[model samples]
Target chain A: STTVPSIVVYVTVPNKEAGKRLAGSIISEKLAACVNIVPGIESVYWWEGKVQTDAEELLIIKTRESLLDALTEHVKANHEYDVPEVIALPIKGGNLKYLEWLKNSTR
Target chain B: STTVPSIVVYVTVPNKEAGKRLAGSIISEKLAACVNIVPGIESVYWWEGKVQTDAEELLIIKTRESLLDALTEHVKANHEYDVPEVIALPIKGGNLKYLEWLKNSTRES
Candidate 1:
């Protein structure tokens, strides 16, 4: 069997607790194999014709391509912000053992 | 013009300073467009036939495929460990503006 590749979904949440909650929910629902919550992320972006800075939590979610649509839907429904950052990157290579575990754990 | 794709190069270093220095050097040399330094990373992996845990720094480097070989060589020469984790993952999609900036910022264009 060709080892199915994984994807990294990046999401920014309001706070650390909120990020953890979202991660837990996704993992519990089998949408993600693992969600790494990174706190105290300083995000500077352009909004309303000005540069704005805010303290946000970044969630690095690992999942398969087949689950992206469902995972994105879940994030939008649970996200607090009007426009949350939800981007997915394909995993080209990783530790074979950990990648395998990530694939099996999600399913 | 065909849109050039960016690669996310993940590197694990001994400490935060080392990670920052490595990232800074790469960025300064135009090998990478940007490098995000993430400190206080707890990594658990097998080493020397045992499961070991350590507080390491993670460098999320954004660069193009053309520079990957040079970047890897630079990393291996400067990395403190015997086998540093230098992995590259493809960026399938991203914000159009940001992606364009990243492409232009790197020499891969």
Candidate 2:
């Protein structure tokens, strides 16, 4: 069976600064090909036994599956939150050129 | 191997208004559990001959994998673009509580 080598990672941050800081590092380190920082997001989730809501920025990272561990580690090190959201999703299909570029951008 | 039931779909739109409209419909129709309308995204991708860039809003949709086909069709019907970017990505793991909420928010299929 064929396997997906690339992934799209979702990481939430409190603000643009955190999102940019982490996204910059991820790109500079070659852990990901590209990181899209989407702002003005109101995120709702379960926290401390209650549904918590906050104005957040989401980091949409495109990278290789081989670098998941390293990318996760890098995000943890730079992020302010103790337990930040670092969820990875497999890319089933997409623009072939962009996908190829995504593969070439990272190590 | 065990399969994943949930997915995180990425769909790019031209602006905030478009994003909100599509997202609201998806939520109301239960095509997805939650839709995060992320604005201020500049997407660079391949076009007819070269790489083209555009300011776009991204819809981060969380829903059951069973609704993928229906969701895609809905997006196409409502979208203005000829070929909208409606790609589905498998959700491997996340906050268990939130994930459960995600499952409960959408229909079985």
Candidate 3:
């Protein structure tokens, strides 16, 4: 396939301080090209046989599809959440410049 | 390709209020199915020959791949940003239930 596929890894953190630390460390380690931390995200999910709501910070990571495994492993190793919401969605298409930048920056 | 294609529209706004307003309006109009807004996001990009960093809020919209055109036009008409950051990316795989909800929630394409 000629398409240069990418992935955005979504992670939820407890607070800004931890989010900042993880975002900095993840990019510095080259696990992701860029990590945008969005604070004050509300999430509603099922937990413990009940509906659970959380006021959480979100980590929006930009990286390649190939790096999902590496990113997942790194998060599991360092994240505080027993089941850190490490979700990856594909980049089917994007601006040529930014998408190229993402591919060059990752891996 | 036999893939049940979907899109996650990424938009950036200056603050929470603007983001919430835009998100609510889009979903209510059925331009998108579900919109999730995350506050206090910082963005760094080039502008006016300088690398500018701004605190921004992000809107992540879940909808079908087919709605991109209509969604884009609706945003342009209603958005506050001169060049609103309305970027759409694909949803290749997700929990089947959520993806189904996304599909069922969009316009018939």
Candidate 4:
């Protein structure tokens, strides 16, 4: 089977404003095809020394695996957090048409 | 380096109602550890040879890779759309503790 190099990148921001700004920046730079800004997310994860929970917005990004480095760098430069959460997950499969659009929308 | 078998699944529904219902079902069935129901998402894609956009709710699911088949089947059975979007993305790496919690919440199946 031919695997698509598309990836779904996840990033968490402090609020909606940061999410929108970061998302627009990524889009404008052609680092990603599209970004789905999911707001009002309650995130729980391991922090410095303990588990922490906070209200944050998630940016679900679609782009080729080749752009992972640039995307990560862009997020770091534009995000407020010192160590922003920028993780990439490989897309197994999905709507073929949608996948095509995703590939075309990005560099 | 050992790769974690955890996966993040994405499934879209017509609205919040369907999204909640499907999400609840998956959680109840132990198919996933956590389900983030992202409501009021504007989805754009090609359908029937034309570009279409609509309001949809996206369910971001966290589960083990082993349960993908069962999870997909469950979504199909519970979802309203004839061809509901059921896709899995391999988790590269993240919070080890959270990944542990994710694995513990799901079943062996």
Highest-scoring model, lDDT: 2
Each candidate's B-chain TM-score, in sequence, is: 0.89, 0.88, 0.87, 0.90
For model 2, how does the per-residue alpha-carbon lDDT over B58-91 read when each residue is reduced to its tens digit? 8888887899999999999999899999988788
Model 2 segments beyond 4 Å from truth? A1-38, A42-54, A59-86, A90-107, B1-4, B45-51
- Ten contiguous residues with the weakest lDDT in model 1 chain A: A42-51
DockQ for every model, please.
0.19, 0.25, 0.17, 0.17
Index of the highest-DockQ prediction: 2
Looking at model 2, give its docking quality level: acceptable
lDDT of 4 by residue, A30-67 (tens): 99989998788755443344334467889989988878
DockQ of 3: 0.17
RMSD of each: 6.1, 6.6, 7.1, 7.2
Whose lDDT is higher: candidate 2's or candidate 4's?
Answer: 2
Tell me which residue pairs clash in candidate 3: none
Q: 2 or 3, which is superior by TM-score?
A: 2
For residue B38, what is the lDDT in candidate 4? 70
Worst-scoring 10-residue span by lDDT in model 3 chain B: B93-102
- lDDT, candidate 4, B4-86, per-residue tens: 48888889999867876777678777788767667678999998999999999887788889999999999999987899998
Q: Single out the weakest 10-residue window by summed lDDT for candidate 4 chain B.
A: B93-102
Give a tens-digit lDDT track for model 2, residues A1-107.
Answer: 23338888888888888898988889999999999987888654433544345688889898888888898888878888765667778777778888888877888
1 or 2, greater by TM-score: 1
Q: Give the lowest summed-lDDT range of ten residues in model 3 chain A.
A: A44-53
